[PDB]
Design a protein around this nucleic acid. Structure first.
Ligand code: ANP
Ligand code: ANP
Ligand code: ANP
Lengths: 480, 486, 480
DNA sequence: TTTTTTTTTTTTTTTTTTTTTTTT
DNA sequence: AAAAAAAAAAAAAAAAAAAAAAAA
């Protein structure tokens, strides 16, 4: 027969929607109809495919060629449809045995020499192909991007002849290159209490507010914090890489498994810091996925932008919807905020500037003082690295909390929060007494319980103790 | 001569308007013409249908073909016009007996091998076909989506050969898979999670039992949002006839309902920064907004003082009528929006409050049946664990089911949707009740609509008390839920 | 087969994307198909190429032509695609040996007689071809514009026959004509102290602050401060030329191998001073790239634009976006600011309204005492031409500084400025009592250490000896 | 008094439909 | 002979200028 089927993937936003390239060589006169809502592949892929096939010592059908791309009601954007179309034409013309086209995808754009150039935003395609247990044969120019995954059964090719031989024959095509922290917690000299609070915050996945005078080192703590976080798992690292390449370029292989850290400037722009429209562009909120987001000088952020942060903090994703489409763009980040503890009624106005809806779901608050000149001038003779052991500790604590349930201590709800904390009478009377002394709100009490559970788990205690609650109180409260 | 008249459906908004594909072969040179305002997505079905016909071992006419997908005013958008066109071509080429197409509606998309593909937004077409008594034939990929309807006159096929064999000889096609029966026992939510907010928990229970809109006022931290979220569990499951109306909107806007919550009342909580186009109706080819997506469910408006007033002013029409006539200067769609409203507001963010107040629309707050002040939860009921945790959602849901069922006796409409033949009459106000109402009204400075929206609330309370008439104590309870602001 | 590849450039904004023109001659009927999102100006080059080849005593193929222009997803705008396409056609038709087209890059449109014509925005293409070490061949009309940069290995032709002759047998092809000011640092009046402060600032790359009565000086010394900095390399000169070209003017007479100097007036503009809008254009900040930015009367301007300078001051670039594109311009400069000693609370408010976060980044501060008649005896102070020796010393200083670590003293962090300053016990002893005298912030302390390291490294010292630290204490910040 | 922010209006931009000059 | 190259209109959104409401 003269009917062939091929597979590829079109990237809209962050998802790679599967496409089904269908070629049917009729018996009429030379034609190359390309039905399916292609925009720039319509009249351009035709000539590139023709020349690439001819120059690779192949017969180009002298027939009526009809190419139908995937779902009809789906615009198709990229230029990587030249390789699937060329292979479909060859299969339909019997120059390739089509019995071996079932399990393989194809992505790439063909030059006029038959060579394979490199398309953009390829890692999402690799993810989708591996998820479906399909071989993904890409151009050599994308070998660097594809090698991050190290997924087996993926290959790369130099030109079309290499792929045609890999299909007709079984020659190994190219495979992939095997797999082509510097700050450390130690640099934070003599802060003690704040460092320990940040350590337990990392261990519990809590969000922490850093209040202190200017030049106290808040930004340094935020920058060094990401060393605490455990190295991203393979799947999380691949998700981060996918969200990255949608924007272009990849200076990876030195940090590809270190959690992201974003510190948007307090001016920024709502569309940039939150999602993105037009062709869906992830915002600074989304590049922090599985990582840390540092909102420096929180009050100077406009409340309108901060109001949107309530969605991703609670859902783990942020969907931005336009008249055209709405995309997922996961935003499962960990928040860190910084703010000056006010300089009079000016203090009241300053605290009024801040967005209560966001500040009420920040699980922690630590006050930072300027350094002691004795420690500031003393040398960093205590150069022993320590972030390594703390990272292993955080891994252990997160594993415990996952063992309890899929929700970290930071994401427990009221019912599960009360069910997981033992909260015996011994601690209950003290808790009632303190609440009588200081009037915590409904959610402040549960934040206190969550932080107390984090501390208790850190100490390996099977149950929350009064000492743990007394410790958690110090890291509790908002503002003065 | 040979011409064929195949039927199909085109969706414009929520209604699937019938379309009559009309193929006609002439003896001229082998061209191919499509009329009837065919969009590009459907104007390129020419070669696709040609290939799907040739590959299925048929004879594609070498003749001047002329398709007429039109009532000439309606533009055709979907991609499901390939199966009707292919069958029309075959019937007009005498390869299919034209009497087989007597009362069938075909919806499908053809690949280049004849294999059928799944179109989107199929539920409205299935509903329309069922209402028209026509047989419907769809691609296998839509069998899962159309299984909810449970209509016995729908068939699914794998490729064009299957449909051709069915029409010519009737080889039974494939029927649709069984309806997805499931349970809801858990809900993972429960009415019990609300700890100690007893007074305001007994006011949502008589708003679920009377369709009354409810306004939640209170300081932050208290469980206004949590109570709103739990409210949906109170409402009874949706009657199939209503779950289909909701599933049509779900398919049109989103895709693939969950098959488990498809009979649970919807709960939508739009975020105040969302644009009016997303909240009310929609531009472009019209798409349901949040308001319509909450059809037959609960619309939770959090932070009522917020939201552009252009939106809150438009909610009067859905609350009175039940549908939003979104206009685009070319046509207006219906988009049913019969929802139950729940509001949340902060009574105080001096005389500066005048700026914060009046940002809302007074008539909207006048349309809200109830207002309950969520007091901050006290320490004794906050520290104390859930010593009592027996499930109440099931029992209360049974109560509301019974209360609704009884409520349809006098009038099917719920006591909230009851007019001045109900504020007077249905509410069998007695003499002593008349004097009590006279005294309280004269003492209280209330508008004329103030007198109304107690008779309905009092009737709801009486119905919960199984009293033939209001006993002068139900009115006493009702008064406590009226009033407004601080 | 009949298949030839040529190279050119496509200039958008400040970057000249590489484009690989690909030409294929098939056996079909006469035709001319372009590919790669070629605009009307590019896509109309068919007839121009045909006539230019025909009139140059060449043979235009009767076969079917098929030109594929570089990346398939990059629209092509410029009109300089006629020469690459003509050369590609000739190479594919065996009229030229295609080995010559290996490393050359061709630019410039073709008249209907075969004569070449100039094309706008040529400097970015020259820069890009320089970075890639590719022989660029341009129209003779563009020689008068390209040669000003003084870049070699670039040849200019008048007609297609000249280029064909050069490629076939290397017949000269002309060359960019030759490229066709004292400022005498010694001119500055007898300030001595401020001269030494400027010298250390240049040596270490520090940002310096100037104080004195309005118009009493500063600007006179600010102008000549640029003379001490080392001469720009060829690549840096071409970068500055490209930025000034996208601005839209570099005929003038600028000697591009010397550092620029920009002195925006304090009225300023939030768009011109930072970055251009509407059509992205370089702001005054980027025009100072690899130069000196002089912000006279710092208290002027506004408390927002000075915040946007925090990023480029350290990162070295400015990113301007309007949700439609992300445009990056280099902003590596050595900020020099000036301020009068304010015009009591009435005088405290003036310095209290300053941009504290940005001022904190200005390492140095000196006082310019006014002169009346002392310098009127010009001989014996102006008659030494002191610029050359200072520049030589600065070159050696930069070389040694970069040798110690890949960062100038002015861009070290709290880590290196302790591992490199290598203060012992007495050295660390002195600064403790100094800090006890004045408890400066951590940033001020590290600025002191950096200035002291600069001074020590000028004296061929192995460590930060006391004398150097005592000298560095001279400047500090003395806002009052 | 001695001084600044917030909100609205006008102008502008982008996208889509329309349109208007194409592609064959 | 058939659309896509284009000056126009509207939906929707954003920025700068301006009004003014507010505050030093
Ligand atoms: N342990 C430490 N505590 C505080 N500052 C430190 C410490 N170690 C080093 N520093 C230095 O202290 C300086 C303070 O800058 P930074 O850490 O950014 O504070 P900041 O609060 O972010 N700046 P600002 O927002 O204007 O107040 C940096 O230059 C650090 O290198
Ligand atoms: N019985 C209760 N009453 C009030 N709040 C509760 C109760 N039990 C738990 N909560 C808290 O309430 C949260 C959810 O409701 P809520 O505090 O109202 O969130 P919200 O979105 O901020 N609504 P609001 O309190 O009005 O701002 C839970 O996460 C708990 O922290
Ligand atoms: N004088 C009256 N006598 C009897 N019924 C009345 C009277 N005035 C109002 N109503 C009733 O009020 C109900 C609601 O109508 P109404 O409140 O007038 O609508 P509306 O005018 O759009 N609301 P508003 O904009 O606040 O005036 C009607 O169904 C009547 O029963």
């Amino acid at each position: 027969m003269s009917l062939a089927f091929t597979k590829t993937r079109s990237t809209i936003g962050i998802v790679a929607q599967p496409v089904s390239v269908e070629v049917h060589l009729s018996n009429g006169l030379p034609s190359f109809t390309m039905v399916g809502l292609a925009e720039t592949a319509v009249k351009e892929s035709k000539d590139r495919v023709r020349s690439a096939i001819i120059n690779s010592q192949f017969e180009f059908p002298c027939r009526k060629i009809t190419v139908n791309l995937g779902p009809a009601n789906l615009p198709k954007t990229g230029s990587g449809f030249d390789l699937p179309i060329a292979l479909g034409i060859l299969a339909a013309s019997e120059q390739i045995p089509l019995t071996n086209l079932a399990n393989h995808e194809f992505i790439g754009e063909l030059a006029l020499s038959g060579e394979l150039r490199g398309v953009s935003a390829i890692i999402p395609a690799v993810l989708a192909a591996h998820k479906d247990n399909q071989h993904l044969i890409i151009a050599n120019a994308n070998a660097a991007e594809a090698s991050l995954t190290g997924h087996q059964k993926v290959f790369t090719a130099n030109n079309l002849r290499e792929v045609c031989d890999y299909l007709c024959q079984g020659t190994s095509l190219q495979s992939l290159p095997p797999k082509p922290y510097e700050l450390d917690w130690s640099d934070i000299k003599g802060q003690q209490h704040a460092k320990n609070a940040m350590v337990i915050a990392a261990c519990g996945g809590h969000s922490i507010l850093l209040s202190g005078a200017p030049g106290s080192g808040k930004t340094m703590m935020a920058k060094r914090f990401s060393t605490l976080l455990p190295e991203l798992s393979e799947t999380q690292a691949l998700e981060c890489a996918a969200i990255n390449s949608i924007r272009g370029k990849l200076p990876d292989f030195r940090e590809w498994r270190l959690p992201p850290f974003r510190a948007p400037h307090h001016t920024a722009s709502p569309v940039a810091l939150v999602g993105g429209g037009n062709p869906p562009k992830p915002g600074e909120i989304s590049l922090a996925h599985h990582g840390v987001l540092f909102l420096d000088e929180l009050p100077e952020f406009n409340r309108q932008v901060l109001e949107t942060l309530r969605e991703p903090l609670e859902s783990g994703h942020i969907c931005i919807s336009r008249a055209a489409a709405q995309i997922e763009f996961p935003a499962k980040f960990q928040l860190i905020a910084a703010m000056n503890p006010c300089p009079p009624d000016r203090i009241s106005r300053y605290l009024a500037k801040l967005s209560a809806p966001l500040l009420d779901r920040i699980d922690m608050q630590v006050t930072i003082h300027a350094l002691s000149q004795e420690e500031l001038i003393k040398p960093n003779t205590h150069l022993e690295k320590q972030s390594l052991a703390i990272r292993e500790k955080v891994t252990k604590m997160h594993e415990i909390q996952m063992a309890r349930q899929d929700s970290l201590n930071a994401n427990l709800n009221s019912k599960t929060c009360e069910m997981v904390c033992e909260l015996g009478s011994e601690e209950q009377l003290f808790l009632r007494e303190v609440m009588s002394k200081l009037k915590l709100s409904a959610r402040g009490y549960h934040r206190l319980l969550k932080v107390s559970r984090t501390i208790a788990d850190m100490n390996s205690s099977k149950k929350v103790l009064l000492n743990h609650l007394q410790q958690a109180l110090s890291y509790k409260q908002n503002l003065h």
